[PDB]
Structure 1
Amino acid sequence: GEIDESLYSRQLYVLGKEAMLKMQTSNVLILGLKGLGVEIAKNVVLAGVKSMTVFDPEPVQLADLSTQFFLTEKDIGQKRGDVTRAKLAELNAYVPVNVLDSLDDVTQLSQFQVVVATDTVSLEDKVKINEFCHSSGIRFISSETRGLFGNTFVDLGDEFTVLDPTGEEPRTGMVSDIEPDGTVTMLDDNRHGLEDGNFVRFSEVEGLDKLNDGTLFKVEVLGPFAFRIGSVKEYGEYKKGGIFTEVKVPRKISFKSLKQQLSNPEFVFSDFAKFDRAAQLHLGFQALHQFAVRHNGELPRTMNDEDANELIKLVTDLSVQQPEVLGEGVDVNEDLIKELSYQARGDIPGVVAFFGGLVAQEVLKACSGKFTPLKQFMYFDSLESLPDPKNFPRNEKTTQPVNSRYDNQIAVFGLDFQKKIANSKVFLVGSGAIGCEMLKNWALLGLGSGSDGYIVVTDNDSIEKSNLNRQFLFRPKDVGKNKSEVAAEAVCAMNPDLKGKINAKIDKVGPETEEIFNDSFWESLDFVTNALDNVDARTYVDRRCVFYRKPLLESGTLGTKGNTQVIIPRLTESYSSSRDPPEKSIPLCTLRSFPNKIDHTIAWAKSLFQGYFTDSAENVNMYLTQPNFVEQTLKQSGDVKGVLESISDSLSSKPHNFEDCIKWARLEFEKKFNHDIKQLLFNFPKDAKTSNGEPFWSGAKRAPTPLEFDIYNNDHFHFVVAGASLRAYNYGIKSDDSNSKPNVDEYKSVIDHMIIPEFTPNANLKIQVNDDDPDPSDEIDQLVSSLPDPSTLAGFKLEPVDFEKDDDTNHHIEFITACSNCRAQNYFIETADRQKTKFIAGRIIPAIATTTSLVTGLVNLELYKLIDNKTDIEQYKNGFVNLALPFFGFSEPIASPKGEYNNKKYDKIWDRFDIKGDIKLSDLIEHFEKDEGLEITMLSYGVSLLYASFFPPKKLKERLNLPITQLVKLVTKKDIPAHVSTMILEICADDKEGEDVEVPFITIHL
């Protein structure tokens, strides 16, 4: 029952302890270790299953390297299985990887809980193996990729229980009324957010007591603010209170066999724009197998017409035999099938990544009952990825093998297109999860391996242990090294064509690094690809991409959810053109005085952590080293009184040993969880009432109760231990040969001898109830005269704590958890454990390799579109996914908004006025009226107004004759730095009729 959090941390927030515990009792067998098989296997081994066993006794051939990133040219002739085994093993020490030698005896399948059959296994053998599996409770999944086409089939047997359909947090909410008929009204404007047929339980509902016993109730949604649960008159009559918590009930489901499904398939669609294709591909994929039977294992020849017509005919025969797949009067889509024939030998990195992620996640669903399985067939194509044949002719000559690793990509796109990929110049921003997958895909493409091509990848972060769960280029021995650098090296081992072609940098992108990432750097690129973990960075890269007119491939993930976006110069909106939901803020009064959720106590605790151990130290150090500090604080701090008390207290207390730190922490316990609570209760007693005569402490205001310190309570104990240990670190006091675990009896003898001063109310203190209602010099003079003179404390420094969520020995989460939970006890909120507290306080993003590879695969299929400079927006696909559902959907990008001034049409995002040289103001104004029909009304550099048509003559004579750089110097009193090669100027202008008109911006090239 034991899970390594230091490795699995981020995945654990996606799957949960239970699912991962089942996963670790599941043996998995993968048949076929070409690209598809190895992608699936990589993801499953990373996720952590009891064992992985691979079967593939076929010899390695050069063409196998198209997508099989663990094969090298040296491996040629040896068996795929044998050669791959050790490289999969290095991905996760906890998962043994074995090789099954022979599958002559199907009976061997009994050792496994999930069997996966890839592209190497014949249909006849798939049906046999599936029948063995289905009839003896072994979960079966198959998948196949053929060029830009692919599918997957799932059969988990007659009995499969889904334990959690979505992986979402259960809904929760506060209740203000429950009527006799069962109508449940939410408190105030809070949305229950349930769906008809959800189930809930209740606690704290006063007057209905058996309704709190854990019984579930089926939900009938009435509006956003009410639902119904069936009559409750039999349980009592509602008085007040109440919290509902949603429960996911189990669901039993049935799968059919592969055989039954071949002729009555149940589809999940990969793209709803393409739904009429699933049946057709379903026929086509079966036909490829019939074809192989008739041609001695061989697939249709690449780009071959005779064979395509054979396939069209095989499909036609099949629709007669399986009348139910197309249905009545639906013709065989002959062009589709012809392309499937044409491409049948293609092995495409993006498609292999898409299916590898998807199918790996289906494997994990099958082991665990977490998430809703795919039921039962999905088909996919990315035909829009094909270049225009005008630019890259596709035929038997262009598509033919050339005896290289790229032969099965060439099979689809042709040699010249493949060479163009090799000559691309690309910037990758990030070398984490998306970054590693991206570079693997690029290695497989040969992207940047041509003498005109290159890759730059930058990332300033170093490899941490939890990274290894989804950043498959890194090993335990790489921990501490730099991501971009290790990644770059790793992919060159995978494809040596890239040796010397990847520039791995350790710089962060942003305004501060524009000297490195400068005009010349950016202008040289063909496109940019993001691999980032936050929104501000994405926004910055998007802006630069607009300014330098470069395409941008964007993606992102959150657990099982993911998306792709394309930003194309002079065609689409940019990333920053649209808004995402912002993070909801907790009100200040709720944090300070009236918390009702653990999220609130965690925020509070995190902030106390900052103040106690970081901010107060930083302040003291500034005060001791800056002789003006006190004067500086007075004029400029919002909270003056706070900063001065924090210095005063930090310097009078001054512990000499660890015992003193224990005492400080115990007294802090008393202040925070006893005295401050008694104070809040002095101002608002339990029974206190509001203006209308209603009880004050209702709804979101939960009446607290002060804590009596009890060292046997885990949270009380750890508050003191962690608080003492951190204090000690601040003051440079050695912790108790701190390798020692903290000892209850030892702390108790110190705490037991303490005199803990009694609480005295304060009748002056007024507490802020709502955020609207406002609230909080000679004590300040007093507080200044109390401060020690800094030459009293020569060479005295405090050591500020730099918060680090991922070191379990450092006391930080220990403290925040305990501090949160003590306040939770105050307010009768359920306490949380360290993992949960770390997720919230640490703003950890849930992450798993399956979603990461799939989404990356999708990006690398839009990439093909950039190589062909596609200008038809209808060809591009923004993608949206949730593998938990499973759901895939796509949308054509939005066009850039357009304007007009006079008779000129322009792109509101992408067009600008490029001016060569440090032009004089008058020459610029003149150029615009003469060449653009624009009378400039206002012209600005950032914040500062350089010219305006209302300026009177004296002022205009000052400016008109100045070059722009000098015009900026005159206004901003500040020089332009040496390195700056461009300046953006915003303008307002009137058109030829003297009307204000929106226009592009100006770039000055210095």
Structure 2
Amino acid sequence: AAGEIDESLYSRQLYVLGKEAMLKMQTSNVLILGLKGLGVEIAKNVVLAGVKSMTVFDPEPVQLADLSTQFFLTEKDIGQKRGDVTRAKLAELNAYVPVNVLDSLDDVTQLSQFQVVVATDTVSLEDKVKINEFCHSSGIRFISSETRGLFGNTFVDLGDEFTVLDPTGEEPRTGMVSDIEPDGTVTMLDDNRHGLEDGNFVRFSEVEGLDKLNDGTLFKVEVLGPFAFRIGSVKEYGEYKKGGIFTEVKVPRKISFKSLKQQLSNPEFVFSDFAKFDRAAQLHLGFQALHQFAVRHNGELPRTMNDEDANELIKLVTDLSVQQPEVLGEGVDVNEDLIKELSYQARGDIPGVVAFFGGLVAQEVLKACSGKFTPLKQFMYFDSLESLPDPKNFPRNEKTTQPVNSRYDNQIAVFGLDFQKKIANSKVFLVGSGAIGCEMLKNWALLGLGSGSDGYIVVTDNDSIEKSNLNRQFLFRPKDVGKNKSEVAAEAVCAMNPDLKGKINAKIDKVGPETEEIFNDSFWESLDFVTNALDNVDARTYVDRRCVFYRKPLLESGTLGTKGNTQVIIPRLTESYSSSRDPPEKSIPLCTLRSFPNKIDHTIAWAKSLFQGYFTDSAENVNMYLTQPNFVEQTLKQSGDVKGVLESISDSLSSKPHNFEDCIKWARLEFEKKFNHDIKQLLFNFPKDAKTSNGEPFWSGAKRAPTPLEFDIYNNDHFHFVVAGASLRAYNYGIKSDDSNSKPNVDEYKSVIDHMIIPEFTPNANLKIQVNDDDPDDEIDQLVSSLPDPSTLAGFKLEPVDFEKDDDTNHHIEFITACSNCRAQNYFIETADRQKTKFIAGRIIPAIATTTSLVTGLVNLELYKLIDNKTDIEQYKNGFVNLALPFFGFSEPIASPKGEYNNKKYDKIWDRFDIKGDIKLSDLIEHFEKDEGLEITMLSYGVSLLYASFFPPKKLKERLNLPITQLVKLVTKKDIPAHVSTMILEICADDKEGEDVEVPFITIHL
């Protein structure tokens, strides 16, 4: 039972990696050496991802300080072996992956049992070089990684031959062609961009006149501009006539890695941050120097914040640069402060850095197993030194950073005791307890965030745990399915760190406009900062606006597959989230959906809306009609599509099925209408051979001439359209399925369909069909008098379907896939399978744990900068990543725009006029003139104009004496609700010269 993937657990990951890659991952055995923080983080991500087996080696005994980042250790484990104690926790992450302990590595020859060996911070450099030599010379892929305080690195060596099967994981480019010239110049249809790059390869289909160009041969692309590319002479193939689709093909690439010993002396770097590229050679020397330091001190690292040892580390680096001048370069000095910091921090074990490397290295493990994505080639170094607090507020020296006999001792090694107490005493709100959220809470448990007596965490999420979540929401187990995310997460991180017991408040409330009573002034004002862990833009915008209104910092992040980002929003300093726009989703023109599809996305959207109509909308409508004595009257005066609502009601109540056999009949007749009749009508209006006024053929380019379908129960899609249609119709009308216990029987459906008289198509010569979205496009009394009186249907109720993409038994994706593919057959579009249909109809976001951990690590390195209240914008980093490439880049936040009125500077995002009390209008106007030099010219509450300078005296006399709430009452005819504590008012104003100037908004505190 391998060669198949558990879609119900791996569905989201499957969309990032693909089935081939995952089948290879399922034959790979992985070995991790070292199970401190870094190792357990790698191992967690790799075990969630699904490899054939995971084996861990760490015979070292657990000490208290290991718990800094090793979230599966507990104080009870102290004295026992790390490997032994961690194993059973890693196993619970993924029942499909055995997790074993390797007792001993004295015999290196054991390594051969493994395809990928990863060596962490616990393995000496000398042992790394031996192990890597053994691995490299024997075909075993090798990765190492280390973290030291705010610094880290990784090294990848996949051997002398490694084949990358797909370098990016992007959808292959595809596009329609309108011409191919004899020299191979391919012109795109209309204004469609090919989107290719020089060196891509493509295949072709449907190119008439160049027959063998369609046989799957690849052609190498030369880009001419955005709308043309060139493929080499094609005169040998024939002469282009018409048609054509190109599809990008990713060719395999063979690449070669060198051994650790060779790369120690001549490294190839990938940069983790281009602003810091000069440091990658320094740290390369510095990490070698740590290891030399350890050899000279009996396996020990430099002492925390110790000067003598730091000067020894600097001497060691200086000696490496003299021995190898090409390394930093001719006459480039050692960066001594950098290397000093490396020494000072060498023992530190920082959660964010461990997360960042754990995700990155885990993902490199999966690349090594599959050939999916481009491997890191070969060394990457990182630092987050900006995370250090200002030494003026939190001095770092041997006393303040010393161990205190606590799990936090190796965070204290970096930041000092007082800073670590301030972390404990922070009050934080986490919005979302899904992938980012589980990772976030794990990091916060490791920080001790909110564990102090002045601190706390609030986390909220309204959603419950679903099976596919278990692939990347690592605090949840199979038995937690159906429970609340936030509540289960909060409990799990208290088992990881009991200092948080009673300090996390898990709520189940949605954060939005409808929950401002719970999440009220007092709630928001108490917080030090807010963090998002969200899956949609609207929630993000909402939280961002709250953080602006209440002046709190916000940490934002997101992922899509291997892609991710971080954003910090700092009061009085930066832009907020809402300040910039992201690309909207592409909309499909309506004509293309209705009449002229050419891609499966079009047929899936059309199918999805047919589903909505047949099984949800038409039922809701029937129920409203039978329960609302005014419904017909309300519909006539207020619907866009009036005739359509009343026909849906008419058709739902005349065709009433009495048994399952009627539901089969109904589905078969719908097949006829949608894939035979309706197509014939479209062909009647525009025949196959029709031409435009210019004599060009009408059916060309994006318009593909359809063929009507002849139902064929042996065709998988036809069969399934009738099975799903019938079972859903039955649901609607509360009829028992002949299939609610069982798979559907072909012969049984067939004998029902075979006995039906299917009515023939008659063209309707009246119907015009709309060609473009530009072009535009009484019988209702009859339709209304045909409706049955509701009292003939007392107690009749239809049961609407609530789309559920993740229940394979409910026929939903089955219907949408089949309905889509039948239309796909009509228009000669390639059919899609269930998984792909579900991805598109279900709007599923590709997701994986690696990226989630890494991005969360980076959020928690910014968090340190909120703890120190940094106001220097250049210290903060917005992050952007794509692990597939791999690529990491960072940018300092954009400053908030500033304005001026009279002599006063203000922040256009963060400043506002705070007015205390339900002030009278006159007092408000006078206050602005007298205190701000501003002549108020318009004053509004939402859409309602409350005052304006052009109001005549009679209108001003009604208003000037009114408190703001009574002014709002007078204009809207609605009282302000009682729970409302604030009112935002927008003003226009003139300044002291009589000139209109932009100014902040007002907030009324009631």
Deviations along 1:194-246, one digit per CA (max 9) or x if unpaired, are: 00000000000000000000000000000000000000000000000000000
Other structure's SS at 2:970 match: helix
Q: Is the contact made by 1:875 and 1:892 (CA closer than 8 Å) also made in structure 2?
A: yes
Cα deviation for residue 321 of structure 1 reads 3.0
CA deviations over 1:313-361 (Å, ceiling 9, x no partner): 0111112333332121111110000000000000000000000000000
Structure 1, unpaired ranges of 5+? none
1:739 and 1:719 mapped to 2: Cα distance?
19
How far apart are 1:625 and its partner, in Å? 0.2
The 8 Å contact of residues 902 and 991 in structure 1, kept in 2 or not, is answered as: yes
Q: C-alpha displacement at 1:412, in angstroms?
A: 0.2
C-alpha distance in 1 between matches for 2:583 and 2:101: 48
SS at match of 1:1002: strand
Task: Assess if the C-alpha contact under 8 Å between 1:726 and 1:811 holds in 2.
Answer: yes
Cα offsets for 1:64-111 (capped at 9, x unmatched): 000000000000000000000000000000000000000000000000
Contact 1:91 1:475 in 2 (8 A): yes
Counterpart mapping for 1:98-497 below 5 A: 98-497=100-499
Q: Distance in 2 between matches of 1:471 and 1:321?
A: 49
Q: 1:868-914, CA deviations, whole angstroms, 9 ceiling, x for partnerless residues?
A: 00000000000000000000000000000000000000000000000
The Cα shift of 1:428 comes to 0.1
Please give the per-residue CA displacement for 1:236-290, whole angstroms capped at 9, x wherever unaligned: 0000000000000000000000000001000000000000000000000010010
Q: Deviations over 1:907-961 (max 9, x none)?
A: 0000000000000000010000000000000000000000000000011010000
SS state at 1:165 partner: coil
Map Cα deviations across residues 745-781 of structure 1 (whole Å, 9 max, x no partner). Answer: 0100000000000000000000000000001xx2100
CA drift at 1:740: 1.1
Q: Shift of the alpha carbon at 1:393? A: 0.4
Residue 687 of structure 1 and its aligned partner are, at CA, apart by 0.5
CA distance in 2, matches of 1:761, 1:115: 69
Report if aligned partners of 1:51, 1:95 keep a CA contact under 8 Å in 2.
yes
| Residue aligned with 2:21, SS | helix
**Separation in 2 of the partners of 1:988 and 1:863?**
38
Q: Which residue of 2 aligns with 1:835?
A: 835
Deviations 1:415-464 (A, max 9, x none): 00000000000000000000000000000000000000000000000000
What are the superposed Cα offsets for residues 610-660 of structure 1, whole Å, 9 maximum, x if unpaired?
Answer: 000000000000000000000000000000000000000000000000000
1:456 alignment partner, SS class: strand
Distance 1:900 1:640 in 2: 53
1:556 to 542, 550, 558: 558
Give the SS at the match of 1:832.
coil
| Corresponding residue SS for 1:937 | strand
Tell me the CA shift for residue 131 of structure 1.
Answer: 0.2
Measure, in 1, the Cα distance between the counterparts of 2:210 and 2:300.
71
In the alignment, the residues of structure 1 paired with residue 460 and residue 59 of structure 2 have an alpha-carbon distance, to the nearest angstrom, of 40
Q: Deviations over 1:108-156 (max 9, x none)?
A: 0000000000000000000000000000000000000000000000000
- What's the CA shift string for 1:290-309, capped at 9, x where partnerless? 00111101100000000000
User: By how many angstroms is 1:738 displaced?
Assistant: 1.7
* TM-score, length-scaled by structure 2: 1.00
Equivalent-residue separation in structure 2 for 1:418 and 1:240 (angstroms)? 70
Query: Are 1:263 and 1:324, in contact at CA under 8 Å, matched by a contact in 2?
Result: no
Q: Do 1:688 and 1:697's aligned partners in 2 also have CA atoms closer than 8 Å?
A: yes
Cα separation, 1, equivalents of 2:322 and 2:614: 77
Cα separation, 1, equivalents of 2:318 and 2:910:
49
How many angstroms apart in 1 are the aligned matches of 2:573 and 2:36? 38
Distance 1:924 1:824 in 2: 64
Separation (CA, whole Å) in 1 of partners of 2:104 and 2:307: 37
Alpha-carbon contact 1:197-1:220 (below 8 Å) kept: yes
Contact persistence 1:464–1:479 (CA under 8 A): yes
Q: Secondary structure at the match of 1:889?
A: strand
1:47 shift after superposition: 0.1
On the 8 A contact 1:199/1:218 being kept in 2, the answer is yes
Deviation track 1:11-64 (CA, whole Å, cap 9, x = no partner) reads 000000000000000000000000000000000000000000000000000000
Distance 2:118 2:500 in 1: 32
Residue pair 1:201, 1:246 contacting (<8 A) in 2 also: yes
CA distance in 2, matches of 1:972, 1:27: 69
Q: Is the 8 A contact 1:264 1:324 kept in 2?
A: no
TM-score, normalising length from structure 1? Answer: 1.00
- Structure 2: state its 5+ residue gaps: none
C-alpha distance in structure 1 between counterparts of 2:844 and 2:384, whole Å:
33
Q: Distance in 2 between matches of 1:691 and 1:902?
A: 64
Please give the secondary structure, in 2, of the residue aligned with 1:636: coil
Q: Is the 8 A contact 1:825 1:831 kept in 2?
A: yes
The CA distance in 2 between the partners of 1:774 and 1:453, in whole Å, is: 62
Secondary structure (helix, strand or coil) at the match of 2:767 reads coil
How many residues are matched?
1004
Q: For residues 945-989 of structure 1, what are the alpha-carbon distances to aligned partners after superposition, in whole Å with 9 as ceiling and x for unaligned?
A: 000000000110100000000000000000000110000000000
SS in 1 for 2:741: coil
* 1:928 corresponds to: 928
2:740 to 723, 728, 738: 738
Cα deviation for residue 737 of structure 1 reads 5.4
Measure, in 1, the Cα distance between the counterparts of 2:458 and 2:337.
40
1:693-748 deviations in whole A, cap 9, x for unaligned?
10000000000000000000000000000000000000000111522110110100
Of the structure 1 ranges 929-938 and 735-744, higher mean CA displacement relative to structure 2 is found in 735-744
Task: State the shift of 1:549 in Å.
Answer: 0.2
Per-residue Cα deviation, 1:771-792 (whole angstroms, up to 9, x for no partner):
00001xx210000000000000
Aligned to 2:753: 751
CA distance in 2, matches of 1:217, 1:555: 40
**Equivalent residues in 2 for 1:17-28 (5 A)?**
17-28=19-30
CA distance in 1, matches of 2:822, 2:750: 18
Q: Do 1:877 and 1:893's aligned partners in 2 also have CA atoms closer than 8 Å?
A: yes
Look up the SS of the partner of 2:573 in the other structure.
Answer: coil
CA contact (8 A) 1:187 1:699 kept: yes
Contact 1:803 1:812 in 2 (8 A): yes
Structure 1 counterpart of 2:595: 593
Asked whether the equivalents of residues 429 and 459 of structure 1 are also in contact (C-alpha less than 8 Å), the reply is yes
Distance in 2 separating the partners of 1:2 and 1:591: 34
**Runs of 4 or more consecutive aligned structure 1 residues displaced over 6 Å after TM superposition:** none
Comparing 124-133 with 316-325, greater Cα deviation is found at 316-325
After TM superposition, give the deviation of residue 192 of structure 1 in Å. 0.2
Q: What do residues 472-508 of structure 1 show as CA deviations (whole Å, max 9, x unaligned)?
A: 0000000000000000000000000000000000000
Inter-partner Cα distance in structure 2 for 1:138 and 1:114: 6
Task: Find the aligned partners of 1:740 and 1:130 in 2 and give their Cα distance.
Answer: 55
